[PDB]
């Protein structure tokens, strides 16, 4: 019943500002403080601050005092955090969560922030051609920023699929592979197509893989 719908992922330029939202449903917005926590890979979780949506009172971790600004709109049951003077250190996942008082064990799904001066770039998609079990796949190369979405035969091919985590190239652009394992007898019969979807560049590409 309780759902915390956070804003979509954002890409921001260095020194710019970004505002992310956190919509509350299923519980009384004013009765619970809204905390904000930061997750960088490798570092762990950092506590940013809280707001009391009834009174608007805020406290901040001294680390984030000047970075973050917390606001809340009782009318829409929505909490806000604004990051300013963005650096690459501010690239992280920011969670929104009523940790106090107790009784709402759920967090928001998380907004991913990327701080880069670079423009978006769509992926190039190359096949990994096969040739009683043959492997085949798709190489999704040279995109920015994250993430990329790979599905197979529009969705009807879920079993045996391995979409690997993105790996950062020396070019500064991400790359990943998506692989599927299938019987080799069905190679000439079944047609295998991977559906690559890169949202920040509004790019959809479908690539047929054949021996």
């Amino acid at each position: 019943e309780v759902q915390l719908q956070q804003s979509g992922a954002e890409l921001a330029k260095p020194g710019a500002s970004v505002k992310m939202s956190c919509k509350a449903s299923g519980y009384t917005f004013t009765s619970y403080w809204m905390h904000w926590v930061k997750q960088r890979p490798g570092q762990g979780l950092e506590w940013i601050g809280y707001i009391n949506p009834s009174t608007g009172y805020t406290e901040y971790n001294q680390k984030f005092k000047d970075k973050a600004t917390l606001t809340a709109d009782k009318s829409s049951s929505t909490a806000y955090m604004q990051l300013s003077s963005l650096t690459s250190e501010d690239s992280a996942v920011y969670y929104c969560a009523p940790l106090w008082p107790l009784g709402t064990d759920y967090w928001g799904q998380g907004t991913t922030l990327t701080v880069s001066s670079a423009s978006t770039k769509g992926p190039s998609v190359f096949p990994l051609a096969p040739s009683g079990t043959a492997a085949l796949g798709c190489l999704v190369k040279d995109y920015f920023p994250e993430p990329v979405t790979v599905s197979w035969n529009s969705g009807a091919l879920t079993s045996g699929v391995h979409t690997f985590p993105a790996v950062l190239q020396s070019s500064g652009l991400y790359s990943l592979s998506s692989v599927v394992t299938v019987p080799s007898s069905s190679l000439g019969t079944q047609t295998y197509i991977c559906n690559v979807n890169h949202k920040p560049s509004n790019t959809k590409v479908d690539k047929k893989v054949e021996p």
């Binding site: 905390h35 570092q43 762990g44 979780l45 506590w47 971790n61 680390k63």
Partner: peptide, 13 residues
């Protein structure tokens, strides 16, 4: 995680 002393801090996992 702890609240005892603010700021709240988390573990590395």
């Amino acid at each position: 995680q702890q609240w005892s002393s603010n700021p709240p801090t988390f573990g590395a996992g």
